[PDB]
Amino acid sequence: ALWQFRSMIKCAIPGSHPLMDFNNYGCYCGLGGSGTPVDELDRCCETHDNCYRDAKNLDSCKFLVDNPYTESYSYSCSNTEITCNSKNNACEAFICNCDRNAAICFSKAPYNKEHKNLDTKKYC
**Residues that are catalytic:** 48, 99
User: What's the min distance (Å) between Cβ of 78 and Cl ion?
Assistant: 26
40-79 binders of Cl ion (CB under 5 A): 62
Q: How far is CA 43 from CA 38, 75, 124, in A?
A: 7, 24, 13
Interface residues toward ligand TUD, by CB under 6 A: 5-6, 9, 22-25, 29-30, 45, 106, 111, 113, 116
CB of 75 to ligand TUD, least distance (A): 15
CB-based contact 90:61 (threshold 8 Å): yes
Asked if residue 84 lies in contact with residue 106, where contact means CB atoms within 8 angstroms, the answer is: no
49 marked ligand binding residue: yes
CA 23/CA 97 separation, integer angstroms: 23
Q: Which residues are annotated as a binding site for Ca(2+)?
A: 28, 30, 32, 49
